[PDB]
Amino acid sequence: NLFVALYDFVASGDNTLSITKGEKLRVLGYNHNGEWCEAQTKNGQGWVPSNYITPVN
């Protein structure tokens, strides 16, 4: 379940996580509508937009 970030995302509201373009992340799950993804990176854990990431081998 390893993904890469398509774009920078700046943390904003509740429990979101900043990620940087090209950064690798692990995905734990999704919110109720699937539009937010709960991810882990070396910087921590939190929600990121699901359309800002994609799988990498």
From Swiss-Prot:
Localization per record: Cytoplasm, Cytoskeleton; Nucleus; Mitochondrion
Residue(s) carrying Phosphotyrosine: Y7, Y52
Modifications made to the protein after synthesis: Phosphorylation at Tyr-7 by members of the SRC family of kinases disrupts SH3 domain-based autoinhibitory interactions and intermolecular associations, such as that with ABI1, and also enhances kinase activity. Polyubiquitinated. Polyubiquitination of ABL1 leads to degradation.
Coiled-coil parts of chain: none
SH3 domain sequence ranges: 1-57
UniProt note on tissues of expression: Widely expressed.
Function: Non-receptor tyrosine-protein kinase that plays a role in many key processes linked to cell growth and survival such as cytoskeleton remodeling in response to extracellular stimuli, cell motility and adhesion, receptor endocytosis, autophagy, DNA damage response and apoptosis. Coordinates actin remodeling through tyrosine phosphorylation of proteins controlling cytoskeleton dynamics like WASF3 (involved in branch formation); ANXA1 (involved in membrane anchoring); DBN1, DBNL, CTTN, RAPH1 and ENAH (involved in signaling); or MAPT and PXN (microtubule-binding proteins).
Protein family (similarity comment): Belongs to the protein kinase superfamily. Tyr protein kinase family. ABL subfamily.
Subunit structure: Interacts with SORBS1 following insulin stimulation. Found in a trimolecular complex containing CDK5 and CABLES1. Interacts with CABLES1 and PSTPIP1. Interacts with ZDHHC16, ITGB1 and HCK. Interacts with STX17; probably phosphorylates STX17. Interacts with INPPL1/SHIP2. Interacts with ABI1, ABI2, BCR, CRK, FGR, FYN, HCK, LYN, PSMA7 RAD9A, RAD51, RAD52, TP73 and WASF3.
Disease linked to the protein: Leukemia, chronic myeloid: A clonal myeloproliferative disorder of a pluripotent stem cell with a specific cytogenetic abnormality, the Philadelphia chromosome (Ph), involving myeloid, erythroid, megakaryocytic, B-lymphoid, and sometimes T-lymphoid cells, but not marrow fibroblasts.
Protein name: Tyrosine-protein kinase ABL1
Lineage: Eukaryota, Metazoa, Chordata, Craniata, Vertebrata
Gene it is expressed from: ABL1
Section of the entire sequence shown: 64 to 120 of 1130
